[PDB]
Nucleic acid binder design. Sequence first.
RNA 1: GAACUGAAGAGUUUGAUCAUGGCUCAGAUUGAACGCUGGCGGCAGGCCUAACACAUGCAAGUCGAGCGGAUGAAGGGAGCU
Length: 154
Amino acid sequence: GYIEKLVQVNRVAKTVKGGRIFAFTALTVVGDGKGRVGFGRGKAREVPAAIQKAMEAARRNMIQVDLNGTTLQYPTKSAHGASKVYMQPASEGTGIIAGGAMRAVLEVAGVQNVLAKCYGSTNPVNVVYATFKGLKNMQAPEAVAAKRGKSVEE
RNA sequence: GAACUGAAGAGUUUGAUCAUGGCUCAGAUUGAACGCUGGCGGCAGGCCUAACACAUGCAAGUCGAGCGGAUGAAGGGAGCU
Ligand SMILES: [Mg+2]
Ligand SMILES: [Mg+2]
Ligand SMILES: [Mg+2]
Ligand SMILES: [Mg+2]
Ligand SMILES: [Mg+2]
Ligand SMILES: [Mg+2]
Ligand SMILES: [Mg+2]
Ligand SMILES: [Mg+2]
Ligand SMILES: [Mg+2]
Ligand SMILES: [Mg+2]
Ligand SMILES: [Mg+2]
Ligand SMILES: [Mg+2]
Ligand SMILES: [Mg+2]
Ligand SMILES: [Mg+2]
């Protein structure tokens, strides 16, 4: 898909005999607004080159999510590193109640009512890791219902 | 047929990084006070401190169909005029 969003641009440095060498890191998310989504990281010596590399990396390794009509299936709670993430479905009139990496990830993924919240560190890359770990494990019915028939598991 | 349906983060320790951890900010509220400024109306509110000391007015009276008593009009008039 093609929906580009830029999350964070940071400037890092390494020390050499002579002084400091600077570089730029960029984090981006891509998706089609209907279930495909992925993130990418890039590094370069200029901001546009890093952004381009991040877009190219993010356009690969895109995954498919299972969403129940512009909203999640069930309340979920994921984590990565020291970051914890909580999301839960909301009514249609609700917006996206989230901040930073949450908002970009969920808006690009195609959901509109997510009402999320994060605990622990708010490092954007770890937050994105945690959010995709949570979203990639959305089961949806007819798959958790592989044990037996349908309309009895619910 | 309703009586509820709802949760955002950021800055700052390093040459740079992740974590831990404190400090600070973005919101809503006052019986508020102070500074600058000030057209109108509706509805409310107005000694949070000294249960400190109080000048002067008013804030608890009524019943003569319970009872003596004294003030006893209007008049009937009479008398002298
Ligand atoms: Mg050497
Ligand atoms: Mg480098
Ligand atoms: Mg954790
Ligand atoms: Mg842990
Ligand atoms: Mg913390
Ligand atoms: Mg902090
Ligand atoms: Mg510095
Ligand atoms: Mg003042
Ligand atoms: Mg004044
Ligand atoms: Mg003034
Ligand atoms: Mg008082
Ligand atoms: Mg006083
Ligand atoms: Mg009186
Ligand atoms: Mg009586």
